[PDB]
Amino acid sequence: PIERQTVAVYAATKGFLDKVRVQDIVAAEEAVISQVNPAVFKILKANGKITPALDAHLKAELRKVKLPGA
């Protein structure tokens, strides 16, 4: 779904996966979408844009995911 693609690109283009080695990024994004709480995808789908309220709770939820390896 498009709301789970944009969080996986927000996790990568901002730099929340720079610590993760390139061998385990397919495992990292599968760990991003699973461990980030699923209510943030309902906000981004309904608002249809990363609202300035939402990227704070996105960046809060993106720093508390356990990325594999590293």
Binding site: A39, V40, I43, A46, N47, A56, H57
Partner: protein, 542 residues
Amino acid sequence: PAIDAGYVSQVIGPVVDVRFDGELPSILSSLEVEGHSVRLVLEVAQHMGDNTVRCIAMDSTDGLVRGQKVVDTGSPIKVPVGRGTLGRIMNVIGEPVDEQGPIDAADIWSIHREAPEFTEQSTEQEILVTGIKVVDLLAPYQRGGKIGLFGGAGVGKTVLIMELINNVAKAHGGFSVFAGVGERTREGNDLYREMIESGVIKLGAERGNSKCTLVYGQMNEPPGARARVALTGLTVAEYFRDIEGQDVLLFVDNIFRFTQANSEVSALLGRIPSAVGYQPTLATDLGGLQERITTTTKGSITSVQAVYVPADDLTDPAPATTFAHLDATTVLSRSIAELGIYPAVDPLDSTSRMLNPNVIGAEHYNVARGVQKVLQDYKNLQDIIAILGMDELSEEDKLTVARARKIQRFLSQPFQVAEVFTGTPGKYVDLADTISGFQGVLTGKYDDLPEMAFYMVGDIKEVKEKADKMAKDIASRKEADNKKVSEELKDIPSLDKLVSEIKEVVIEEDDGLEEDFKAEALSSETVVLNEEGKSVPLPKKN
């Protein structure tokens, strides 16, 4: 009533033969088939003998029976011309397709003309600045000349012709005509909604202040419609040139589709094909059309035609024939576009009759020929740099490579019509800013700056203000540590009540496609027509 009415003799795709018992129409005469689903206009192309004409249909021929009455109009295809066509869309046979009512015609002109004579030619080479760096410098455009944009499917000759509409049509005082020949209907609706927002086309009561006539024969049309819609687009422009005395702009998107649609037709006219598969009459069909688009003594047409090269083959007989009909060719290259340089103009394949020192001045001319000198010298090194690298060139040729790698970024330019899909705003560059900017990269005034500072900027001012920004940005890695502090209580509520302020969508099961659906009852066995015309099943035999 029985005479002057032929019957359809035979139907071979877009080519219809009509047998006239009494008297035959002229060649180029237009006919009408009675009882078609649409208005089917045939145009007489050949007298085949035995009282049969051979015609080209302007719409589809599906549903034509070989006895159908065809009446002669006694004239060629006549389209409405005049100021009443401004702001209107016409198709090939002059019908309004914009749903704004009938066209308030000043006249109904035949679309078939003789080209204007030798005594009515004008020899007055004045420049037309387009604001495009590679066009204004290396192949400048004549103010009343024929201009070709040669391209290979996806290289940018509609974005270039829309930028020429954006740059020279607003600054023009006369009337534009757009002949969309064999292009996408999506682009004909994009251009229509753009010209209404821009005020070039006004609807309703303000229609008389429109400055553009659209004529559209797009690629959903049969080959007879695509073969004559360029002739309809000239006739609107030929009226403003001859009768109104105006300076006309004629934009013809893909004049190649005129040549292609005459090749889908001539296979069925029983001709022996010429080279690669085109009609034997390629050069005189194209020359019959292109000689009508001229500046005469009573008006000028600045025509800009896009020419499609069919498989990126410039030696294909349809682009090669068009090259002799133009004053300024702008050959666009698929390999320039793969470098990301836009507009993808080949600087060593685009020519103009204006690039002459007695027409554009010796200072503009000398920096054009010096820009083409170092780009040819970089092309002569292109395989030594490939198989041996830049390490083995001379120190006087590594200056040739580095300068030519700079001016081929400096010919690149952002467009005001490409700003939607590229994000960067468009840059109009004046003529003197291009001549002075390309003196500087030739003399060596900008050997300091990097190559990428020249990429996609307007002027030589903008390369200096981008060479700074490329060095402000590598210093900005050491700038500051961005921390977002104490904002969770200022204006951002929570995540849980942010769910409670979304609106739940009423998702509906049972998709319900049986709304307004008639559902005729198709029976099992094949229903056929018997000899009395009734719908009966198939008999059981073989």
